[PDB]
Ligand SMILES: Nc1ncnc2c1ncn2[C@@H]1O[C@H](COP(=O)(O)O)[C@@H](O)[C@H]1O
Ligand SMILES: Nc1ncnc2c1ncn2[C@@H]1O[C@H](COP(=O)(O)O)[C@@H](O)[C@H]1O
Ligand SMILES: [Cl-]
Ligand SMILES: [Cl-]
Ligand code: NA
């Protein structure tokens with residue numbers, strides 16, 4: 087009773103009575119007991135949450151003893167969740183720790199997280215499998231739960247550059263790109279706060295399908311804690327920064343109008359023209375061409391245009407460019423209808439064709 | 450077996466390159482203090498490679514130091530902090546030699562502790578709280594040319610992004626760093642000592658008021674780790690042939706000459722003991738590169754404060770050559786009162802800035 091309070095005396099003195107009282111009553115769901123999740127579960131419990139749940143099927147491979155905070159030679163081949171509850175039941179016997187040695191899915195979530203008829207306060211994504219994460223975040227958002235997602239920690243080697251901001255604003259982190267694009271594709275643009283760092287290492291040997299490669303055995307720690315920290319502060323009501331968002335709705339509208347015009351010029355069907363709404367103009371400009379004309383590189387006064395004459399309107403057959411560039415394009419390649427090989431050089435058409443192949447991956 | 454080490458540490462091996470690891474193995478790392486930050490540090494370098502660490506921490510694993518310490522559990526409370534680690538780390542890294550030391554750290558024993566076995570220390574990590582001992586340590590680190598990192602403070606820290614690693618010189622902002630740097634500079638050293646710290650502004654809710662009797666307040670369970678992990682990350686990335694930010698220092702040595710030149714010149718126009726390193730302190734640390742009269746950073750100079758007192762650190766003020774000339778005629782030569790020339794708003798701020806400095810002596 088009064089022995090518990092002396093263990094966390096530090097946090098009681100910092101966040102206060104009102105703040106700390108609010109943390110105890112919460113219930114957190116950790117999806118991924120891996121090298122990054124490991125820490126959250128610990129730190130959350132060390133800093134003193136009574137109830138958390140860990141969801142991870144796989145066992146601790148000899149690999150993980152480089153990063154995993156609480157594991158040890160003796161825990162090789164222990165289900166990652168099973169090891170935590172064992173190495174946290176010596177920190178806090180008071181703490182209920184629901185350990186689930188099963189995989190998470192869209193279909194089992196309803197009957198697994200609500201278990202014993204109690205809602206969760208927080209979902210912490212600490213997954214690796216792209217296909218599984220996006221699904222979790224979709225489910226996390228659409229049910230309106232306070233939720234934070236870890237991005238990958240691969241290629242990262244400086245703890246100063248790490249950050250927590252809205253998934254929308256991870257432009258320059260190649261690791262995040264793979265998920266937020268796939269998550270944007272399902273409509274979710276700016277709902278989620280996430281960890282990551284804008285650290286690029288292209289001069290390394292290492293080695294357009296981008297993948298998770300190596301990682302420095304400390305960094306995952308940094309992430310885990312920085313999440314826990316961010317949880318602890320958000321939950322408590324301590325002052326933090328709000329997440330800035332990258333929705334240039336005004337800019338997406340102005341573009342759409344330059345496309346919605348083109349559809350009245352060509353005089354094409356209303357059942358194909360309405361397909362491109364504000365929602366999808368955003369995706370196209372921000373995630374595909376990254377606010378940059380693929381022919382030149384300019385970013386001032388752009389517009390959309392049907393890419394080929396004969397083919398239907400879709401993401402595979404459309405592109406943005408400078409007004410002047412779409413003026414030419416509209417006039418030359420599709421209205422007069424001459425082959426695009428004489429209007430555009432080799433260099434560019436290879437950059438375009440691949441830039442659709444990459445879009446066809448996320449479809 | 451070698452194979453154990455490699456297959457266990459593989460992901461790092463593949464990250465930094467075998468040539469990188471070779472160096473990590475060679476390292477003999479002294480970690481002074483193993484309380485919150487120290488504990489973190491120690492664990493990670495062992496866990497991430499290093500097979501030779503010394504730890505120096507008297508106090509025992511307090512029941513409160515559970516939401517902080519990196520491994521410690523209820524079973525091993527009331528146990529020497531250095532031992533607790535040795536046990537947990539010798540279960541994860543049997544290959545690793547962790548010479549724990551119950552004893553406390555002094556300027557005198559330092560050598561007879563660290564060099565005892567005969568191996569020269571490659572890297573020192575300050576994780577202390579007693580300011581005296583910390584300075585005494587950082588002092589020792591530099592005089593014995595040992596690549597050294599030092600935790601500053603985790604007091605009033607909320608933001609895991611603001612955590613920076615850099616030189617003492619650059620930590621102007623972080624309020625905690627002052628007491629540590631100030632003394633350090635006045636011992637005769639304000640460059641070379643790498644330090645982790647958050648320059649996170651003092652949180653408003655729990656302009657001429659600065660009297661440094663301000664100290665450490667409450668921690669936040671997670672933050673110590675951020676510091677620990679980061680200075681581990683740092684040490685690992687440095688030792689291994691891996692690229693790095695390369696922290697750069699704000700020691701305006703050129704400036705100090707040009708301002709001292711004004712002071713030295715004022716002495717020859719009147720009727721010289723003041724050092725260049727002493728000015729640098731007066732300039733950067735006390736007046737903070739800004740006149741207390743105007744606030745401008747341009748065309749600055751020194752000048753004897755009042756004619757009655759001896760030329761000391763508590764009786765020379767930095768200001769514009771504009772302000773030097775006026776002050777020189779009116780207070781040094783014409784012999785006027787101080788209340789007569791300068792506003793009381795200034796003369797207070799100047800008094801406090803001496804009562805600040807008065808402490809550090
Ligand atoms: N679909 C999934 N649902 C839940 N956990 C998963 C799923 N796929 C993988 N995991 C686990 O989550 C871990 C992610 O942690 P990490 O690789 O350290 O970021 C993996 O190592 C798996 O053990
Ligand atoms: N003079 C000293 N020499 C070495 N270690 C010290 C000295 N004074 C205090 N410490 C240790 O510094 C650590 C700081 O950790 P903490 O008290 O948790 O902030 C404690 O574990 C102390 O035992
Ligand atoms: Cl959120
Ligand atoms: Cl063992
Ligand atoms: Na809330």
Ligand code: NA
Pocket residue numbers: 339342343
């Ligand atoms: Na519109």
Ligand code: NA
Pocket residue numbers: 596597598641642643
């Ligand atoms: Na150094």
Ligand code: NA
Pocket residue numbers: 486576577578600601602603
């Ligand atoms: Na400290």
Ligand code: NA
Pocket residue numbers: 246247610611612
């Ligand atoms: Na930063």
Ligand code: NA
Pocket residue numbers: 639700702725726729
């Ligand atoms: Na100097």
